Structure formats: structure tokens, C-alpha cells
């Protein structure tokens, strides 16, 4: 069906992770490490490929809160895997590091958004954010705007760039994952689960991404 990152209850319209600096009072420069933009589905476009959830359980935390138990509760429709090719080709005291996200739903809800930064399948840090529905045409939208990045990730990015070669970065990135779970805050119902895996863009093509459905046949 749709290549969209969407369950039946919630769609990810946009995601970006960026650094922003002020060159001069009038001028700002903004660099996106990763970017998913709103795109509209195209009839021609092919169905999403599938990846077995069992193959990524190790990459992500386990036991409660883990990918296996979340998939068990469901819904299976809501689980997606996104691979990012990060643009590291961008040094300023006082640059801002932020993550911006947008979501859409048919029904107004108060959503809770958990973001877990993981190393070797284990959680370094978690963020829990509350967001509220805003009316738009034919839909309700939820905007996370300029959420500051955790200090771990800022340090991880600077030292990642210090590495002399991209294959080294890729070797690090193999055990770096992010797992995002969006729930209705009160019901705790799962609306959307995104597992993120990473590779450095080995070209100056810049930020690139690929979406997969997560299946448990």
C-alpha cells in the first residue's frame, strides 16, 4: 500500500535532526544530519520491503519496553524500520542541536513520544515528550519543534566527525540505534514505533533514508 510511515492511527509526516548556527545577526545556517520530509504517496511507487522484527531485537533494548514485547502488544501495522544515511559534512561554541518532528492523525489525542538512544542494544538515555493535537485540513497534526538534542548525542556527533575515514564511522554506527515509541498518553496504546539504524553518507549526496515494514511472520 502506502510507503508512508503510518499505522492506522498515526502518521509520521516529518523528522529532522539538525545543528543551527548564527553566522551574523541577520543570517543563520542550518545543517540537517537526517531528514524525512513530507511526501505524498505516488500510485506508481512500490510497496515497502519487509524486515523480520526478530532480526533487530538485539539492536534494541530487551525485556519490558523492548521491541519484542512491544510488537507482541501491537499493533503490527505500527512498526517500521528506517535506515538513515547521515550527512556529517557540515565548529562553533554555541551552535544549537535539535530534533524536529511532525505527526498526523484522524482523531485528536494527547500523545506521549519516547525516544531512546541506544548503544550495543542498551539504552544510554531516554526522552519522554507530550504533544497535543492541532487542527489542519482533513486531519489533526502534532508538532515537536526544536527539541534540544541530548548532550550524549552532541558529543557522539563531534567525535564521530573527528574519525579520519567514513568506514570507521559506519563501524561505529553499526551499534548505534534509536527507538521511538508514540503512545496515546492516557490509554498507553501504541500508535507508532520507529526503529532507526544509521550509516554515514559515503557520498556528498547528503541525507538519505529508506523505509521498511517490520514483520513477524
Ligand X SMILES: NC(=O)CC[C@H](NC(=O)N1CCc2c(cccc2-c2ccc(C(F)(F)F)cc2)C1)c1ccccc1
Distance between CA 90 and CA 81 in Å, rounded?
Answer: 26
| Among the listed residues 81, 109, 149, 191, the single contact to ligand X using CB under 6 A | 149
The region of 4-12, 60-68, 110-118, 205-213 touching ligand X under the rule CB under 6 A is 110-118
**Cβ at position 55, least distance to ligand X in Å:** 21
111 versus 117: smaller Cβ distance to ligand X: 117
53 versus 131: smaller Cβ distance to ligand X: 131
The region of 24-32, 103-111, 125-133, 184-192 touching ligand X under the rule CB under 6 A is 125-133
| Among the listed residues 3, 31, 83, 127, the single contact to ligand X using CB under 6 A | 127
Contact 143, 14 (CB under 8 A): no
The four Cα atoms 120, 71, 215, 39 give a dihedral, to 10 degrees, of -90
- Closest by CA to 184, choosing from 82, 78, 98, 81, is 78
DSSP state of 6: B
Distance between CA 178 and CA 168 in Å, rounded?
Answer: 19
Instruction: Name 183's bridge partners.
Output: 112, 190
| Among the listed residues 78, 160, 191, 197, the single contact to ligand X using CB under 6 A | 160
**Cβ at position 217, least distance to ligand X in Å:** 28
Map grid coordinates 570507521 to a residue: 168
Contact 43, 32 (CB under 8 A): no
81 versus 160: smaller Cβ distance to ligand X: 160
DSSP, residue by residue, 158-173: HHHHHSS-HHHHHHHH
String of contacts with ligand X for each residue 69-88, x by CB under 6 A: -----------------x-x
Binding site for ligand X (CB under 6 A): 17, 33-34, 86, 88, 99, 101, 113, 115, 117, 125-127, 129, 144, 147, 149-150, 153, 156-157, 160, 178, 196, 198
Amino acid at each position: 500500500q502506502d510507503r508512508t510511515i503510518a499505522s492506522s492511527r498515526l502518521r509520521l509526516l516529518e523528522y529532522s535532526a539538525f545543528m543551527e548556527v548564527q553566522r551574523d545577526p541577520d543570517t543563520y545556517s542550518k545543517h540537517l544530519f537526517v531528514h524525512i520530509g513530507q511526501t505524498n504517496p505516488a500510485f506508481s511507487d512500490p510497496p515497502l520491503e519487509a524486515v523480520d522484527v526478530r532480526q533487530i531485537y538485539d539492536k534494541f533494548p530487551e525485556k519490558k519496553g523492548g521491541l519484542k514485547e512491544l510488537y507482541e502488544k501491537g499493533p503490527p501495522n505500527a512498526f517500521f524500520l528506517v535506515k538513515f544515511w547521515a550527512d556529517l559534512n557540515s565548529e562553533g561554541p554555541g551552535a544549537f542541536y535539535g530534533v524536529s518532528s511532525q505527526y498526523s492523525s484522524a482523531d485528536s489525542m494527547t500523545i506521549s513520544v519516547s525516544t531512546k538512544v541506544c548503544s550495543f542494544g542498551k539504552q544510554v538515555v531516554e526522552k519522554v515528550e507530550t504533544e497535543y493535537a492541532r487542527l489542519e485540513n482533513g486531519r489533526f497534526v502534532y508538532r515537536i519543534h526544536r527539541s534540544p538534542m541530548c548532550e550524549y548525542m552532541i558529543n557522539f556527533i563531534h567525535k564521530l566527525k573527528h574519525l579520519p575515514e567514513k568506514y570507521m564511522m559506519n563501524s561505529v554506527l553499526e551499534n548505534f540505534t534509536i527507538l521511538q515509541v508514540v503512545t496515546s498518553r492516557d490509554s498507553q496504546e501504541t500508535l507508532l514505533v520507529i526503529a532507526f539504524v544509521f550509516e554515514v553518507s559515503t557520498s556528498e549526496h547528503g541525507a538519505q533514508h529508506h523505509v521498511y515494514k517490520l514483520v513477524k511472520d
